[PDB]
Amino acid sequence: MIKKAVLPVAGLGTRFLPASKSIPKEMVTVVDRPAIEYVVREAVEAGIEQIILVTHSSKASIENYFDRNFELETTLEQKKKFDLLAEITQIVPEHVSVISVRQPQPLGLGHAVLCAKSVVGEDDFAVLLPDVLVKDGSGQNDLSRMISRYNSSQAAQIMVEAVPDHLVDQYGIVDVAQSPNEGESIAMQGIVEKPPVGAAPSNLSVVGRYVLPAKIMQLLENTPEIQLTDAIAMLQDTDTVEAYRMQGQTFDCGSKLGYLKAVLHYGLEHPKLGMEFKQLILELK
Amino acid sequence: MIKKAVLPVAGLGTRFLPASKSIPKEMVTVVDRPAIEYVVREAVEAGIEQIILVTHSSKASIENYFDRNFELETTLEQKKKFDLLAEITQIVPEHVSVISVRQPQPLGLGHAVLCAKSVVGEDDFAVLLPDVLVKDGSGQNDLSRMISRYNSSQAAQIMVEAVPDHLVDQYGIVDVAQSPNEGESIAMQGIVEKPPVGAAPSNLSVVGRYVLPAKIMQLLENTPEIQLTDAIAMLQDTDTVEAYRMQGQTFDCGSKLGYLKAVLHYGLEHPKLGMEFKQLILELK
Amino acid sequence: MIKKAVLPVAGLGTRFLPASKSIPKEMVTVVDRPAIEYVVREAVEAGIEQIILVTHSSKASIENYFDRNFELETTLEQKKKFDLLAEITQIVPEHVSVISVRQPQPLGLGHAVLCAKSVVGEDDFAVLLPDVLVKDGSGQNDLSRMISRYNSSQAAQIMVEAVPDHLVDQYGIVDVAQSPNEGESIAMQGIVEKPPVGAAPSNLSVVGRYVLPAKIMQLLENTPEIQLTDAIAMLQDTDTVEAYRMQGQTFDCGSKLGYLKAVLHYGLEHPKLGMEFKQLILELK
């Protein structure tokens, strides 16, 4: 049903700046692999098959991560590091293609999604903002829960997550009547950029996961700095839009402290390094 | 007197592999900046003014990190963010120059040093292996102590650090009559690559920081595929070589666990994030 | 009707070798622009809208040619070279997207076309081999003539061109009953690789222009070095395949002498340099 995802990765990484100066923000190492790997793993494990990277001329190392490397592999063979060569040879499954299109100028998220129009065609599709990592815990990731709701409802999905009341002026916040249960959706009437701590329509923050109809591309061509939130506003005119509330946990890597937070949480969960990483932390005192 | 440092960075690094698949392992993120900035920093706080990168066709991003980035700088100016613009324009003092020579094939450390012959010319010179991060808490860095000693003694210096007895297996070990004290040098007859746990002439491992005379280049054109420890042996037949024993602490950023120890230790002491990071860790166990 | 074209550009350019060593063969300059520009211009002027580059990790400069360049443009503004900035800003029209997918290993033309499966989907599509330039003369290019025949007939088209009898062992040659007129098609039963000068089924050579149905992708997944010619053989089982004979002229840039031949023919036709270029040639004696 939903087989395509747009990962808009053409930013210059002004946030996380020394680190992103000469490599993509997406290629920033989180424990032992680049951040992007975690976002592509999340997509693929919700049944995505076509990864559509909207990219910048400086971001070849992202495309190169999901391609084969002749010199690297023959180095790995010559040293008989055979289990490794097997790991770095199938980062994505056989049936998953990774596709590139260029955002010609940095004119925002709406413009980025519009750049993928030709590749999206008449299909319904997901958007993954890759500066945000989602950790699942439950065995079925939020993106998969949220796609199935989209399939069932044929209503656009905006992933949201409860934040503390006194920190709501940091977020895009959705207008809903009540808040849904975790892993459930409710109809939503709009989103408020950074509402004042007094005056937030809810405590439900936009995380940067979407399932949208193809309609959205003609909407983006007709938006009053082309803004996804008011292409979605325009979709409200003919369509239900629902807010899907995460069951899992987000990490904002675009921001140095939420990066350090992912390294700590993912590191401790590392199926191979977790326990040795725990010991390193305890030794700190 | 010691103004040149050779940083051999041509290695692909199959050791921190997933992370360095598509970026140089020298560009791996350590809190908020690539690992290499900590080594170039080390060299500069010890009086170097010409960083010589002995590099690979896939390492452009290392050179670009020490160059100016036009679209990034302007994006940051016409988004009025000048604290960030400081962080990416003055990585090294205006008088520190970064030059690069290609190591055409991976023929070991000694081939890499010898690739720098046309740039070192008649000058004596430091060698820093950028996979090893050295942290000083003294305010005179181990490389500066080691350069003081070279200038005084005129004796070639090999930086070393005691390892547990059951791991001498893993390192070059210096052939030395007595352990020098932390901060001090003594004469050495040679190094032994991975002596068996039984048979080691010390517990002092070769760490990856050397001070060498220009004349090792001629030696390196004659070794018995070119090994620096052999050129150091040959030098022995004419000149005093000494083992400098470090006072600082090391992190092998080549190993997944030495890299995570660097992220913890360097992070805990970040000026800004230090306290917030410190707090993230407490919020865990 | 036909809106998509696959340009398979992942070769390492073993032919035209010194020139292609460190830049794409596709980026080799023909008068005053890279060869690829001529192939993309030909596609767009036959109504192609989606350029699907099947590419290699070494071929970023091809994608960069059809993208915007921040530093280049601001250099061009600062020098008030305003007519130039306008030329290098719209190399392709507004409605044309350029898309990338990687050929993970160099396993031939059939495998290259198969790499674009996800992007081609259920659409019928053209294949342009970009080492071959076609010059039109007539005002309607052969690719457009050939697409319309495909539309009309719903029979796959293989572009061919009459070559001298005594040079037929240099070409893939089509099996047809008679030869069609220029700008016309006839049913074809197969293609013979480099038949002996005695024993060629015709004098009609495969040029490297195709219009194929989407079917072809499941055929390529089921080919006995995956070979397009025997995916087309397999299509013969359920479909007419026709040979469309050029009205225009080809130049094989993959081969140093056919490169020099394009530079001479395109150079003389240059709407701005043609006549001054003629004079330069006459001066040769």
Add this chain to the structure above:
Amino acid sequence: MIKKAVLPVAGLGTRFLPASKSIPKEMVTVVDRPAIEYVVREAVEAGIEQIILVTHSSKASIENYFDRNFELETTLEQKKKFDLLAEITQIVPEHVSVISVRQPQPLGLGHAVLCAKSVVGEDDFAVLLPDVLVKDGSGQNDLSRMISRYNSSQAAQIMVEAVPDHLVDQYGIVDVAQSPNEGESIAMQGIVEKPPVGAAPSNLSVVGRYVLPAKIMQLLENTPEIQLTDAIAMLQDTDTVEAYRMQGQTFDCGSKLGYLKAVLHYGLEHPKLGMEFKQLILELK
């Protein structure tokens, strides 16, 4: 004695613009090889052993051309094509080294030369502007004659070539009492950038080849945005500077017509293609 040559290659070259949009204008194809190989060739046939590239973040392909290409070499071996493999592995003699330093901003020729200060050290040095190709038919190249003269006279050398009287407008022109003969030098008081057609002190244009003493670097730190002709003036107040008048022929590869003249002249005399190319031209008019 003269063993270093500085090749300033950091310029974007908006002059041969379409062609150099996405590749360096130094990597532009001249018959079968990039333009730069003809200049590095010129330097090496005249006794240079350290090519110093003063380069830009977008020019990796220049350095890669003088380095080894692993996937290309092996692809060529396991496709048994060893004449081709010779053409890409021995571009420069084993003892010629290529090093690179970044010109951080485009502040003219004088800024570029001064970027090479840490590499030139105390050595005198040649400067070659790679947009100009010099062809010798004598068997001693103009740069070798000019280096002979420097060594003899100890006088700084500026290579020059007479231009028609109605174009002195377009060039730096040397202030000289009498024209030297082809192959010979005389004393010069200064250069005048684009004197009006009336007011020129000679018809001898500055061509873009200099031999300079180490001490121009100190001068370049003090010029009245840094202009080499000003540093040369300052040098005048202490040392004889001479104008060397060339015997060879020039091609401005920066101009679309000077580049096409290079393709004709160098092609006509290619060992192999020479005769075939010669014939292609006859088959035209």
